[PDB]
Amino acid sequence: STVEIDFEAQKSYLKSKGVDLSYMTLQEIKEANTGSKVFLKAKIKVLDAMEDIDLSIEI
């Protein structure tokens, strides 16, 4: 599983506030001030119980 900073959401927030994003670099976009707001993302996969059996029998 992974947890990360949401880069696209931060970019959209900075664009909405009106900051010029073209001049800054990726590290500066990541570490820019956002004013009491945090953006994160994560990936998980959820297990399920076993409820069916498929048997392939040879001869």
């Binding site: 959820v46 399920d48 119980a49 409820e51």
Partner: protein, 59 residues
């Protein structure tokens, strides 16, 4: 675990229903009690949702 095939020792007997009846009830999104493998247990652990979209998958 999952609640599927959990058996109830308290219950003594239940109204008879055929296998096709149980299957059709389960396909409709109902939680039912069935008699199988020499005991009384629930058929499958599903909730009321029946119609699936792209946003809400079969899971």
């Amino acid at each position: 675990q999952s609640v599927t095939y959990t058996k109830l020792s308290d219950v003594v007997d239940i109204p008879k229903m055929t296998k096709v009846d149980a299957e059709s009830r389960v396909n409709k999104g109902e939680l039912i009690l069935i008699k199988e493998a020499g005991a009384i247990r629930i058929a499958r652990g599903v909730n009321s949702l029946t119609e699936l979209t792209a946003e809400k998958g079969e899971m």
